């Protein structure tokens, strides 16, 4: 299979406006949401049909209780940060944990935190240590690194448990996650040549322009890979035409092991 990943995010807000949750936790496999929990529902719920169908109610019940506890811990942690930063008003706290299973069979794992949307603490599971970006993070680093057992627990969870969950979810959702829908690709003139692709899955795609068989990325405008809403994606890239000299321009698209070239006449 190609590369796949599993990750869980948390978001805490210290003084949220009316209605908005104080706490949200969402899991993803690749680009696909799989799970959701927030401080309003107080329930962990599936976000993909193949999760609902393959995980018995005991799974949602157990993790609902854990998430209620993680919610409270997140509040306490954010209260501590905002006191040590001496900040008033509403501030945000975020966490991301996850792993990747690469095509070649190797793995990665990661765990990090942010305050107001900026890196705060980053875990290194090989040195078993936390990187602190400032002295408020440094205080937290010292406390967390004093609990060596919990670092070892995170290493095992990233390297072993997370990968096992990911393989399990990949099988559950294999009809979605492991399919291929090839792009439909065309070239438009608008002056710049636009190379446009739509209808493809997975979202990972490489589109570029070559001029006389050479690539110059400094003159290519790369569009974002965007969801079309039906489970497929679209993307584009453009280069500007030289009005004083002809050139052989060609759009090159790579998607899921297939390469395509559109030479423009």
């Amino acid at each position: 299979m190609r590369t796949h990943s599993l990750r869980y995010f948390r978001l805490g807000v210290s003084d949220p406006i009316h209605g908005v949750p104080e706490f949200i936790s969402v899991g993803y496999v690749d680009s696909h949401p799989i799970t959701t929990y927030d401080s309003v529902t107080r329930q962990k719920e599936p976000r993909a049909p193949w999760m609902a169908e393959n995980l018995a109610p005991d799974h949602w019940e157990r993790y609902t209780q854990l998430l209620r506890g993680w919610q409270q811990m997140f509040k306490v942690e954010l209260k501590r940060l905002q006191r040590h930063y001496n900040h008033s008003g509403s501030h945000t706290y975020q966490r991301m944990i996850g792993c990747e299973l690469l095509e070649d069979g190797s793995t990665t794992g990661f765990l990090q935190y942010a305050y107001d949307g900026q890196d705060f603490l980053i875990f290194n599971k090989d040195t078993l240590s936390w990187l602190a970006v400032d002295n408020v993070a440094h205080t937290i680093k010292q406390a967390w690194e004093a609990n060596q057992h919990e670092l070892l627990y995170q290493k095992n969870w990233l390297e072993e448990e997370c990968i096992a969950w990911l393989k399990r979810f990949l099988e559950y959702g294999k009809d979605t996650l492991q399919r291929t829908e090839p792009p439909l690709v065309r070239v438009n003139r608008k002056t710049a040549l636009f190379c446009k692709a739509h209808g493809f899955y997975p979202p990972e795609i490489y589109m570029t322009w070559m001029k006389n068989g050479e690539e110059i990325v400094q003159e290519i405008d790369y569009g974002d890979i965007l969801p079309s809403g039906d489970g497929t994606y679209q993307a584009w890239a453009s280069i500007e035409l030289d009005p004083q000299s002809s050139n052989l321009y060609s759009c090159h698209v790579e998607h899921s092991g297939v390469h395509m070239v559109l030479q423009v006449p």
């Epitope: 157990r62 209780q65 506890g69 409270q72 811990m73 070892l152 627990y153 072993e160």
Partner: antibody, heavy 109, light 116 residues
Amino acid sequence: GQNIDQPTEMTATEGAIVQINCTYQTSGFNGLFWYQQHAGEAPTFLSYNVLDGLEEKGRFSSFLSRSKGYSYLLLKELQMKDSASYLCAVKDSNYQLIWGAGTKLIIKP
Amino acid sequence: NAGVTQTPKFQVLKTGQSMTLQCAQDMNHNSMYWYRQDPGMGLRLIYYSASEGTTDKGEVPNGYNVSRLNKREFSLRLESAAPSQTSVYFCASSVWTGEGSGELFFGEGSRLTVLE
């Protein structure tokens, strides 16, 4: 069907070394605990292992092999106060703590 | 600084009698647990409380109920005692839960005997 197995009882002589084994078959693994429980008293925490290898704490060491699904608690220079039950417990993929039935350690003075 | 305080240490009950076991912890822990211990078996979780304001069934909840009264207190209720509930009951607490490495702190145990 998740199982944790450890011998019912072991008997050793004062001053010697004893190794208490615990094997586990669980759906996922988030670490292995040992607790000591004197007769008529509450269990108390002895050790936690989650990566492979041996960890020492005084006269007690605890070993773990994740691939073999096995741990031992090693007690050196046995004393009479080591007479107690020793409970092994494992956290599964759902953080459920699954308890072995305990090993009663009897020490001959 | 007392740790986990549970009561009563001993109790005899007639089948059908009601009983509440009390447990408090002064360690500012968030998670609390009620276990039963019987010969020849590992500890079995009856009910637990992952955080103040939530509780859930363990593996053997039938015949029992619990109340997480506040952050400190977690009571266990036998509404209609049965002979099968003769056991030694342990309350325990942990700083948090849903994490690998945090250990349990146990109370001294409550020995209940239920008789016809």
